């Protein structure tokens, strides 16, 4: 992944987002509702110090669970780390702050098209697809407005 | 689906095919290995009378099962019917006979990009994507050469 947002202002990604589309390098990362990177973003909360708290929903053990994870800043504004047994990088590819944000998680790769509202933004989906066409994605999902307003997009 | 192959010669689709990519209108048609339209084409056998026998693999009850289904001709060369409780149409969108064939199944919609060999044909995938961009697809899968040579693409 060699697309990152230049001049990212992480404070300006604060607030509500919708996981309109997702893609991953391996089918098994996204196939089932309980697949590992089937995560539905709810809210981004940048801290003062420029870390990024993330609220998301994740289907585990037969229900839609709310999770809170912190992505810690690096020396690159568009790149954050998530603390685990494995170090995973969050990369912000592109955003206009007021409509869409594209990001990928890499250790194997999953990316999403976030939008501010429960609407299919064809423009943002086009940019999503263009950013992905370089990458080895083998599964892509997208959600309708009804699904976007349900917990875990059921 | 308003793309069909003009001047289709069904005899010339005979032989070996590989389900390189699949897409569907609803995630639940393709998500799990045991999802309803997660079918992997093996061989097409047009009959003299211009019906189309299809050999495919389908994961059911914890194993990769071989299935044989017959798609019966209609008055349109590019359109076939599969006998069930519901009448389902097979539509041949496009083929060059020697490398790729695009088709959709509709009752809700699933389409595939078939190829003659266990190779990622970017050209055929591009035509697949272009044919789909009109249609309301919410899941897309594609397989690597290793997977293509395994039963049920495991
Ligand atoms: C700028 C937006 C970045 C959003 C990143 C979401 C990262 C998801 C982390 C991987 C999934 C964690 C699920 C879990 O808690 O086990
Ligand atoms: C020209 C190529 C057309 C290939 C059509 C494959 C159609 C698959 C039929 C639907 C799945 C049947 C699975 C089953 O036997 O229950």
From Swiss-Prot, chains A, B:
Disulfide links within the chain: 64-152, 104-111, 104-113
Compartments, as annotated in UniProt: Secreted
Gene3D superfamilies for this protein: 2.40.128.20
CDD domains: lipocalin_beta-LG-like
Keyword field: Allergen, Disulfide bond, Milk protein, Retinol-binding, Secreted, Signal, Transport
Tissue: Synthesized in mammary gland and secreted in milk.
Alphabetical list of InterPro entries matching this protein: Blactoglobulin, Calycin, Lipocalin, Lipocalin_CS, Lipocln_cytosolic_FA-bd_dom
Record field: transmembrane: none
Effect listed in the UniProt record for changing residue 57 to H: In variant C; found only in the Jersey breed
GO MF annotation terms: identical protein binding; long-chain fatty acid binding; retinol binding
Keyword Oxidoreductase listed: no
Keyword Disulfide bond: yes
Similarity comment text for this entry: Belongs to the calycin superfamily. Lipocalin family.
UniProt cross-references to PANTHER family, sorted A to Z: GLYCODELIN (PTHR11430:SF117), LIPOCALIN (PTHR11430)
Protein function: Primary component of whey, it binds retinol and is probably involved in the transport of that molecule.
Protein name as catalogued: Beta-lactoglobulin
Organism: Bos taurus (Bovine)
Gene: LGB
């Amino acid at each position: 992944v060699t697309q990152t947002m230049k001049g990212l202002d992480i404070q300006k990604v604060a607030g509500t987002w919708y996981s309109l589309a997702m893609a991953a390098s391996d089918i098994s990362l996204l196939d089932a509702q309980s697949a590992p990177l089937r995560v539905y973003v709810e809210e981004l909360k940048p801290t003062p110090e420029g870390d990024l708290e993330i609220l998301l929903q994740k289907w585990e053990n037969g229900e839609c669970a709310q999770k809170k994870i912190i992505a810690e800043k690096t020396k690159i504004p568009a790149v954050f780390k998530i603390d685990a047994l494995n170090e995973n990088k969050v990369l912000v590819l592109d955003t206009d702050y007021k409509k869409y944000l594209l990001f990928c998680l890499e250790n194997s790769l999953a990316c999403q098209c976030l939008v501010r509202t429960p609407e299919v933004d064809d423009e943002a989906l086009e940019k999503f697809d263009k950013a992905l066409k370089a990458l080895p994605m083998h599964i892509r999902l997208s959600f309708n407005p009804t699904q976007l307003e349900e917990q875990c997009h059921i």
